[PDB]
């Protein structure tokens, strides 16, 4: 259960893609 916040410093693959 990861937080959905897709930004340039965040990594989507492994958290929320």
Swiss-Prot record:
Effect of a null allele: Mutants show a significant reduction in the efficiency of extracellular protein secretion. They are also defective in twitching motility.
Subcellular localization, as worded in the UniProt entry: Fimbrium; Cell inner membrane; Host endoplasmic reticulum membrane
Disulfide bonds: 2-15
Mod. after translation: Methylated by prepilin peptidase PilD at the amino group of the N-terminal phenylalanine once the leader sequence is cleaved.
Family of this protein: Belongs to the N-Me-Phe pilin family.
Assembly with partners or alone: Interacts with itself to form a multimeric tubular filament structure with a diameter of 51 Angstroms. Interacts with PilJ. Interacts with PilS at the inner membrane. Interacts with type II secretion system (T2SS) components XcpT, XcpU and XcpW. (Microbial infection) The ssRNA phage PP7 infects P.aeruginosa O1 (PAO1) through the retractile type IV pilus (T4P). PP7 binds to T4P by interacting with a single pilin subunit PilA through the Pilus-Interacting Region (PIR) of the phage maturation protein (Mat), and is brought to the cell surface through pilus retraction powered by ATPases PilT and PilU. Then Mat enters the cell envelope, causing pilus bending and pilus detachment, which impairs cell motility and restricts the pathogen's virulence.
Entry domain remark: PilA subunits constituting the T4P exhibit a classical pilin fold featuring an extended N-terminal alpha-helix linked to a C-terminal globular beta-sheet-containing domain, which are packed tightly along the pilus. The N-terminal helices constitute the pilus core where they stabilize the tubular assembly via hydrophobic interactions. The alpha-helical core of the pilus is surrounded by the C-terminal globular domain of PilA that coats the outer surface of the pilus, mediating interactions with the surrounding environment.
Function of the molecule: Major component of the type IV pilus (T4P) that plays a role in surface and host cell adhesion, colonization, biofilm maturation, virulence, and twitching, a form of surface-associated motility facilitated by cycles of extension, adhesion, and retraction of T4P fibers. In addition, plays a critical role in type II secretion of exoenzymes by interacting with specific components such as XcpT or XcpU. Modulates host calcium signaling through interaction with host calcium-modulating cyclophilin ligand.
Name listed for the protein in its UniProt record: Type IV major pilin protein PilA
Residues of the full protein shown: 133 to 149 of 149
